[PDB]
Amino acid sequence: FTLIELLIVIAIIAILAAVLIPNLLAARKRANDTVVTAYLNDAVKFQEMYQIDNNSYTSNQAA
Amino acid sequence: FTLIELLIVIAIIAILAAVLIPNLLAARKRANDTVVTAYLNDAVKFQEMYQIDNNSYTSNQAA
Ligand SMILES: *[C@H]1O[C@H](CO)[C@H](O)[C@H](O[C@H]2O[C@H](CO)[C@H](O)[C@H](O)[C@H]2NC(C)=O)[C@H]1NC(C)=O
Ligand SMILES: *[C@H]1O[C@H](CO)[C@H](O)[C@H](O[C@H]2O[C@H](CO)[C@H](O)[C@H](O)[C@H]2NC(C)=O)[C@H]1NC(C)=O
Ligand SMILES: *[C@H]1O[C@H](CO)[C@H](O)[C@H](O)[C@H]1NC(C)=O
Ligand SMILES: *[C@H]1O[C@H](CO)[C@H](O)[C@H](O)[C@H]1NC(C)=O
Numbered sequence: 475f476t477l478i479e480l481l482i483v484i485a486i487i488a489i490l491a492a493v494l495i496p497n498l499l500a501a502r503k504r505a506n507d508t509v510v511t512a513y514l515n516d517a518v519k520f521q522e523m524y525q526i527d528n529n530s531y532t533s534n535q536a537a
Numbered sequence: 538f539t540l541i542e543l544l545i546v547i548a549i550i551a552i553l554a555a556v557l558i559p560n561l562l563a564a565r566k567r568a569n570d571t572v573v574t575a576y577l578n579d580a581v582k583f584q585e586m587y588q589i590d591n592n593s594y595t596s597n598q599a600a
Pocket of ligand 2: 595
């Protein structure tokens with residue numbers, strides 16, 4: 475094992491470190507939109523439950 | 538064995554001593570950039586772990 479093999483190893487590490495890491499921001503954006511969609515789907519279920527009890531929809535989240 | 542053979546030996550030692558030693562600074566530069574790259578790749582893993590626990594990224598290294 476010699477300095478030229480070790481420079482090749484360092485060079486290839488620099489390549490793999492650059493390319494094998496995903497765009498984390500783009501991944502989290504799509505997960506975050508799923509949270510919003512899921513929370514609105516829940517708010518919709520609870521608007522219908524409030525409608526069962528009160529014959530009207532809520533304007534306030536605490537209800 | 539005589540003074541002329543010994544002067545040839547000294548002359549060739551002076552040559553091999555000059556050429557067979559690598560640029561140590563250049564080698565260490567590329568290893569040092571690997572340390573920085575590796576430490577930032579770790580800091581990135583830990584930013585995602587802090588995001589798992591806190592729903593936000595850290596601004597401070599101690600976290
Ligand atoms: C939903 O609650 C809102 C505050 O959280 C706000 O009060 C909205 O307006 C209502 O005001 C009172 C109830 O607080 C009234 O008797 C009616 O429910 C309603 N008034 C008007 C102007 O409609 C309430 N819902 C909405 C958007 O009307
Ligand atoms: C990360 O910690 C920093 C100090 O280590 C600094 O405090 C940054 O600013 C925050 O300040 C407090 C927390 O200490 C706030 O409640 C917020 O988390 C944040 N303030 C602002 C202005 O955003 C903190 N993160 C960053 C860069 O916001
Ligand atoms: C929801 O009900 C709780 C009690 O069960 C509190 O009265 C709260 O204020 C209610 N939310 C609103 C404001 O409608
Ligand atoms: C990390 O946690 C340790 C305890 O496990 C200390 O509270 C330390 O201060 C923390 N770092 C910061 C400042 O977030």
